[PDB]
């Protein structure tokens, strides 16, 4: 009888850092993916299971909306099969992914004169994440053979790096906000 609150994730005021990406469960509602598609001019909105209009026919047990901020030249890594610091250390999709990846340029909101350093991403990790894993730990990463003793130092790195979103950044370095929709019956078209 009522719509899904997609504006609760898309039009949210703040976004998570990618290494601590938000998941919002979506359920018990009716979702029109065609109005979401035409809700704005997204720079990216790419589905891997079926298309928007096709989705208005299906029903799902649950839909999940993961959201976070990355820089422009990393938006290509939010796709099944990709590699890179983001796809491997921050947010990983299953190879057998049924859902949509939705992104738009966020430069006006998420950059700042002199730099916004609130948005972080994981630069170092000893092994790849599993699909849909989230790691928010902050151990010193031991890049070489000598101990770190829990502090930054020689070959010993804090594992998160900040973006420095400045409004004058090149487009590959500008912030982008991403929503990933997963479709695993409460949610129908």
């Amino acid at each position, epitope marked *: 009888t009522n719509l899904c609150p997609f504006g609760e994730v898309f039009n949210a005021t703040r976004f998570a850092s990618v290494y601590a990406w938000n998941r919002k469960r979506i359920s018990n509602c009716v979702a029109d993916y065609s109005v979401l598609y035409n809700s704005a001019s997204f720079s990216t909105f790419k589905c891997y299971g079926v298309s928007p209009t096709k989705l208005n026919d299906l029903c799902f047990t649950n839909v999940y909306a993961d959201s976070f901020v990355i820089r422009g030249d990393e938006v290509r890594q939010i796709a099944p099969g990709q590699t890179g610091k983001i796809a491997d250390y921050n947010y990983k999709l299953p190879d057998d992914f049924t859902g949509c990846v939705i992104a738009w340029n966020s430069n006006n909101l998420d950059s700042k004169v002199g730099g916004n350093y609130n948005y972080l991403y994981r630069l170092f990790r000893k092994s790849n994440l599993k699909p849909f894993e989230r790691d928010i730990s902050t151990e010193i990463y031991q890049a*070489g053979s*000598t101990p770190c*003793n829990g*502090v*930054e130092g*020689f*070959n010993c790195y804090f594992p998160l790096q900040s973006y420095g979103f400045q409004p004058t950044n090149g487009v590959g370095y500008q912030p982008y906000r991403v929503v990933v929709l997963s479709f695993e019956a409460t949610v129908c078209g």
Partner: antibody
Amino acid sequence: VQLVESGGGLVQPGGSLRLSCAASGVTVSSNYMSWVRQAPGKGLEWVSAVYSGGSTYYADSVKGRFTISRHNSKNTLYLQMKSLRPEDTAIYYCARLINHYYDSSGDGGAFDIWGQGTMVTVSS
Amino acid sequence: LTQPASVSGSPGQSITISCTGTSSDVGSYNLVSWYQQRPGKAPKLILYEVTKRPSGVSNRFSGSKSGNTASLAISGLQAEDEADYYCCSYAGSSTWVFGGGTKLTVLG
């Protein structure tokens, strides 16, 4: 290619001095850096190092008195000295300290790019 | 770190230059480096990670480690090798320690 130092001079005991190490052809903010000093007629002495995340380390003979830092907008490393003693008189070199990612095989751990040096004399 | 103050060799001969630290220095890590210094000039790296040579350093220069003592060996000794030589080692916890220096003379 190059690290160009400046800022050395004559200062009285208990005075202060800021050395600068302007880089060219390497990015300071992407490198471990160090200051190494050499008293006249003596050997090299490691003084200070800066690593990732702004972490900094110092020789015991220098803690509480020197501070290493950098300005990325100027691609320049600095050594800020206070409470200078006569035994701080030396040529001060800055150098790049290679690390694990230099070749991603071994740990590195050596100074391969060296400044010209700049002379610091602490005398009354 | 402890180095001999002086070392002598005739042209074409082979020398060795030792560098003795502690179980905390040379003994605990494979991070020994060596430096050549000429009067009025900055040090030049010639060995790191005990045994590796930078691009451009002649393989007349070689390095080794045994216990708490590293060694620098120079073969085919040339006049241009007359200089000061310094070993250096990781000293734990992101610190570094140099040897006192060795003055190499090429007897002429």
